[PDB]
Amino acid sequence: RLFKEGSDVKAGQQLYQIDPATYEADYQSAQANLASTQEQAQRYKLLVADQA
Amino acid sequence: ADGLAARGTFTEQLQAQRDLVKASDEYYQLADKRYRTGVDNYLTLLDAQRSLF
């Protein structure tokens, strides 16, 4: 609980930490899938100019 | 007459062969670009290089 009680908080200030451990995991999996298909799209972008 | 027939045919047959050679060369050049961008492996570059000569 990372706030002193009875204080004034602003918008977007973090209040708790709910120990992600699954959201981090499928974030890693989606990050790996994006880190494949980004190069897969970039090489096709370079190739499509030469009509290969 | 056979010599005149060979003269009338060979200049077009060699032109067809030259067009075939340059089509294979354009194929090899596109395959080389597709290799060096990283899309394909060296084997399907080497087979096109082989078909070229």
UniProtKB/Swiss-Prot annotation, chain B:
Highest taxon, organism lineage: Bacteria
Disrupted gene: phenotype observed: Disruption of MexA, MexB and OprM significantly reduces active efflux of N-(3-oxododecanoyl) homoserine lactone/3-oxo-C12-HSL/PAI-1, but not N-butyryl homoserine lactone/C4-HSL/PAI-2.
Annotated compartments: Cell outer membrane
Induction context: By growth under severe iron limitation.
Main function: The outer membrane component of the MexAB-OprM efflux system that confers multidrug resistance. Functions as the major efflux pump for n-hexane and p-xylene efflux. Has been shown in one study to be involved in the active efflux of the autoinducer N-(3-oxododecanoyl) homoserine lactone, thereby playing an indirect role in quorum-sensing; but has been shown in another study not to be involved in efflux of this autoinducer. Over-expression of the pump increases antibiotic and solvent efflux capacities.
Quaternary context: Component of the MexAB-OprM multidrug efflux complex, composed of six MexA subunits forming a hexameric tube, binding to a MexB trimer, which interact with the trimeric OprM outer membrane channel protein. The OprM homotrimer forms a 135 Angstroms-long pore. It consists of a beta-barrel, which is probably inserted in the outer membrane, and an alpha-barrel formed by alpha-helices which probably spans the periplasm. In the ground state the periplasmic end is closed, while the outer membrane end opening is 6-8 Angstroms in diameter.
Family the entry assigns: Belongs to the outer membrane factor (OMF) (TC 1.B.17) family.
Protein's name according to its UniProt entry: Outer membrane protein OprM
Section of the entire sequence shown: 387 to 439 of 485
